């Protein structure tokens, strides 16, 4: 536990100059947003309880992207 504590203190007190190489590579890329997608399902169909207009952001993400209609175990079995 003392090893934990001293390691965390060492990490905190130090000074850095960059993130990991991967993130520095990622920041070299920039994109461009455009017109919105097409609705995936009808806007007035309840799918998950609570995900409703009073719960805007999940509702909008779900209706824009659409639910995963295929089981994940079999999908990742081939990956």
């Amino acid at each position: 536990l003392a090893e934990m504590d001293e390691t965390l203190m060492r990490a905190r007190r130090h000074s850095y100059s960059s993130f990991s190489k991967l993130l520095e590579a990622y920041l070299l890329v920039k994109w461009r947003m455009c017109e919105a997608r097409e609705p995936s399902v009808d806007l007035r169909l309840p799918l998950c309880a609570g995900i409703d207009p009073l719960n805007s952001d999940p509702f909008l993400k779900m209706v824009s992207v659409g639910p995963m209609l295929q089981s994940t175990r079999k999908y990742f079995a081939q990956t």
């Binding site: 806007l43 007035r44 409703d52 207009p53 009073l54 805007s56």
Partner: peptide
């Protein structure tokens, strides 16, 4: 006071949506 309803809460947001 002003404990109006939950269904009207649902409908009011939708009415906000439909407006354009």
């Amino acid at each position: 006071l002003t404990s109006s309803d939950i269904q009207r809460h649902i409908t009011e947001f939708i009415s906000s949506w439909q407006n354009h």
